[PDB]
């Protein structure tokens, strides 16, 4: 399973962001809003293939969570679809980036602004977000934003859609990596 692939919780479907690890312990990052109140994750809508259980969840304010793998056999590719990821990097204005998610597949665009505040309502405000012109639609949450072999962010939310064009905000991945002490591979 890789970055961009579907993940199911008890409540709905999100996208796996990146496969990360710490020592010999494998995990995957995804959106905090997806990990919030979820315990177990599965790889299929039937919930037959277990992935693992949530280990951390940071939403609102930030928007990242991490899930610890408990499935021993499922392959944990350090890629995004077939694309290799070798390091993580800070977003910059004008950077060309690509997103992959489980509903829309792969779409490209560029970083338009940094440190943006997105107010999802009811007190769910997230800060420090990367703004881009990439579209995203329901199901795409927590998928990767990358640039070449560099990991950059996790899909959070936005407006518009892929038919008409839209704006998507992403959580900087470096922050998540640092909070959990894990690294891409």
């Amino acid at each position: 399973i890789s970055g961009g692939d579907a993940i199911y919780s008890s409540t709905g479907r999100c996208s796996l962001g990146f496969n990360v690890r710490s020592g010999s312990t494998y995990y995957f990052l995804t959106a905090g809003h997806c990990t919030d109140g979820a315990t177990t994750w599965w790889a299929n809508s039937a919930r037959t293939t277990v992935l693992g259980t949530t280990s951390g969840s940071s939403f609102p304010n930030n928007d990242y969570g991490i899930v610890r793998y408990t499935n021993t056999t499922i392959p944990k590719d350090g890629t995004v679809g077939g694309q290799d990821i070798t390091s993580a990097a800070n977003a910059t204005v004008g950077m060309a980036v690509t997103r992959r998610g489980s509903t829309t597949g792969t779409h490209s665009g560029s970083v338009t602004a940094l440190n943006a505040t997105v107010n999802y309502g009811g007190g769910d405000v997230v800060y420090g977000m990367i703004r881009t012109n990439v579209c995203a639609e329901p199901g795409d949450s927590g998928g990767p934003l990358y640039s070449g072999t560099r990991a950059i962010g996790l899909t959070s939310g936005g407006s518009g859609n892929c038919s008409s064009g839209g704006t998507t905000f992403f959580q900087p991945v470096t922050e998540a990596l640092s909070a959990y002490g894990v690294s891409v591979y």
């Binding site: 409540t11 709905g12 479907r13 999100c14 959106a31 809003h33 997806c34 998610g101 489980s102 509903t103 997105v118 107010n119 999802y120 309502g121 009811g122 995203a136 639609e137 329901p138 199901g139 795409d140 949450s141 899909t155 959070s156 939310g157 936005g158 407006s159 998507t168 905000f169």
Partner: protein, 51 residues
């Protein structure tokens, strides 16, 4: 679902679909409710889940 606190300028992208009266499946409540506002309260909920 109450769409009173809408519209919202942004929605998260998790998937928990609802079926609108226009027979379109909306990916999530926030997407749904913004469509309701956009139709000027003409769109209603048919049922939960995909259409």
């Amino acid at each position: 679902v109450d769409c009173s606190e809408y519209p919202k300028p942004a929605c998260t992208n998790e998937y928990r679909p609802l079926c609108g009266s226009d027979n379109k499946t909306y990916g999530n409540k926030c997407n749904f409710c913004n469509a309701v506002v956009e139709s000027n309260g003409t769109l209603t909920l048919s049922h939960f889940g995909k259409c």
